[PDB]
């Protein structure tokens, strides 16, 4: 043999994956999970689990193909979540696809279906893994996740407004002139249409924009129809309507958070959490909140003192998700 | 906002939107994507524009982009039907191309490809007069030749993404099968894109060490441990994922963001990219293969001239007479 | 010749640098400088300029000797200020070193010296370069460099509080268990131990410190012996105790700005520049403000509202300064 | 602050402070401190534990990186004389080492050598039962001998950075008198460190090219181009840093931080470092020369055959028996 003419064998082959990530459901975000992660260096192995079997094999294989320009060294798939085993992280894209016409409670009980039968398997093959949840609507499907997983609320995470909230402060120092590292802003609370953006603590440079003009963000703002909360949100609506997912989005957003646990950044992402007994809440629910995230998950959580107008929006969002929740 | 920034902000120099480090994507199907976001994420463009016929694609995938921005350090996102959105850019990457229809002819491929071509190639030009134009579609080594016949650009700076995704998988294998890391690895697949593609065995060596000299037979038919294996199952993944999936997207953009690093850095890293071969290699007419070529800044600026054993100098020389052939029935 | 029959040159040679930068001055803290840029992939060509010229060819060459492990292709070095042409950014480190019992003023009058002969052939051979000044004081040397120089306030820039700051929202992360980028606060003014911390504009995760507590910072702060402001200043004036210079920590410090300029990111850096007309301020003199860095050096400045106790602060800085610089 | 983070921050985890990568430098002089900055530079470490017995000294150079601690990624920098700050360390870098001093014997420097490794290996190796040791004091391929003789761990696990600097040096030049970036060149220096380290021409390849198939007299006293002159000009630069300058700080501060590298990323590169060759290029006592290695995780997992041409087997195998002339009048 050429290998062994070439080279000397003097210890044994250590294959155990040190930073094994699982992503569950390889359409476009998954894909697009896939792709930033491998790229960003955050992995030793990628696995991918799916139900279409054929174009499963077909991503894995394309991504083997380029193997060479990314530093993961092992990509596995298949069907059975036995390739997830020993996973520090698995990420949930998988879930119910609305049809048109179908209720809002019809589409999260179909996912509490979906979920039943993929999440007790995750935790057995991968006892101290985090489970990220990426899926719509992400935040009751956190909870779902959570409540079937029997893990601690601090390793199931929702990605939540983590997407919307960095698009927020970028647009906050593209109209500014200014870097966004320069920008603090927070979006909270339910994912979508209700989520709140937090004008009260947006400052750049550390100068809170409110000082300059306290009607930012109102329906008093002299520049109202510029408002960014607003052009967040529709623009993510009318990628949705030309594409079908914001997928690029929030593999990006996933391979943020993804960079956070894995090197124990501890930075703060506004990422979907249990809030019971937190900004108001008094039923078990997951919605966005400033969380700090490390390596065994949520280790804390950033308490900020909503002026009245967020306060309210926050917990009218509350009061519909539970009322979904309760059936 | 308005009000805010004149308050917060006081200024000194007038906001410069000149991009140094720009980059055309032509085609925002899944190659051009993938290549899109390969290069985001590996912090290679000033800005990224995107160039599209079909008015919603287009749009949701520059949006897609442009709303995690946050997460790339690109800045400008941009994108148009226009040429014009194309102005200045370093480097303009063609992933337009016609799709083989059941029971098309290959020869009426290429000339719909040649059409098209021609209605794009003379507008990027027009507007990057300076920029290296990397060709990705397929059939690579003959679009790349209608690509650089049209632009009337020097032969150095038209340049077909070739071998250099193969090549690259064909060492990590190697690597792999050596369980040693594959920059320990040397080893060239270059001609023709594809079934025809000639695997350089005779120089193939891992860590200084030339693997003919550790078994003769290497690559041959009568290999016993049948290296050969490496560069079939090299050329029959592409086809196996095609066939699982539809295209090979995420491998190519891999390719393509490795080829654009070179570039744009002047790394002079050698690649086995389609360029144009007459007087080397032994071929005399005008023809695009994939030969190991040192990419700079400035494109190619020099070939590795490797002596290839007779199989080898055989399997190639055929393949230019195959690319002849077909450029002989094309016209225009 | 084996070159000859293994490449054949299609193109002629492009030796020309497009990201040149040169370091003015070997010393601890050019050189921390030199490894900090090299190993971040900032410069095409690095250029070293000493009139030491012995230790100038040794530092070049032992930089040189491990070039496969930075991205930068070509070092030069040289005592004529020849090899610095064509510069983006020309760091000077050098300057003179205060003589113990030499008076403030004297130690300005010998910089003076040193830079009337370094800083016109820098500009000389360097026309179009930005000037980033790091040697001490940096405030009253950037602003003599600066005359000297001839050109533009946007093109001249001091060192300044950048490092200060940067190690004070440190730790004031550090202190909340916070990873650095949640931290916005400022140290500015005059470098040392007449800094001002903007303690009311401090803020994390969104939310203004001083809201929290009113009293941080000042005397009254309950916990004024752990003041983070006096812990910036008092560690720096002991590296100096210990080793003559914070010199990794402003070599690292001068790699931030660097990256700002080079690639042009808009990011806010508190660095030396011109400050007349701002903040008070009626004289010509350099101190530190919030600065956005980009490719043309400062393109804008960020006007900040500060408390009285702080503007009190600042303005005995300007006074200070103006009074030396009048000699 | 205090106050503030009561009202600021809720908590739900209690801060675990274990490192998960952590590097301990042992010596805080010039090589230990270059090794230190690239380190933290290249966001290799966890924490970085700095250990030295002047007191000073070592409390600088840990305040100087706290200081600036915002600009790289590794958190904890941790200093002390006592080794049980660097407990649970993956990786412990020995530049600890004598100075040879005027008309002091080579013999006498590596015997007070000698004491020193006998006083802080064991604590290292009782803090730090699975680290990896790599040791980068002169003269490399004794001390790390040493240092492995005293740690009592297995040998795969004590690593001196031998030839791994002069052989980057190698390529890197070999590179830029062809033109072509240095990843595209393969050539090793093995051996003895220093004077005596043998080039292995016969192996030196650039782009799948054996360079002595283009001239077979290359690296040799015959050759026209004199070839053999990279070897001599690595080998006198490194004496000629030292006399303008006084060590070679950066340029060893950049080979460690490659080796960390290929270990904490389980990278599986190979680097020509000091290992045992017993029974390896045909030696048959245990002593300490660079050979071709793997490094992975846990530390040296293979090394690759070369076969050495007459005149490299020859060089070689006298700085085998150099070594062990100096193995035989040591005592210990």
Known sequence: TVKEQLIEKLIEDDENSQCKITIVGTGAVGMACAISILLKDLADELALVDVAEDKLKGEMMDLQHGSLFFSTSKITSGKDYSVSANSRIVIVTAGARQQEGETRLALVQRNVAIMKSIIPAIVHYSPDCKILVVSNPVDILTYIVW??????????????????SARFRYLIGEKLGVHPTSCHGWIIGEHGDSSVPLWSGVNVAGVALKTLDPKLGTDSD???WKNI???????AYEIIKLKGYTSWAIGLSVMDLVGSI??????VHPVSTMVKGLYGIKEELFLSIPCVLGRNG??????????????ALFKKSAETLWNIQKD
Chains 1, 3 share one sequence.
Do not use: A, F, W, Y
């Open 229 to 235: 909360h607003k052009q967040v949100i529709q623009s």
């Open 147 to 164: 409540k079937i997983s029997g893990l601690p609320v601090t390793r199931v995470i929702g990605s939540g407004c983590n997407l919307d």
């Open 298 to 311: 949520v280790s804390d959580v950033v308490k900020i003192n909503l002026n009245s107008e967020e306060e």
């Open 222 to 224: 002299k520049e109202h």
């Open 262 to 267: 894995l090197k124990n950044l501890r930075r």
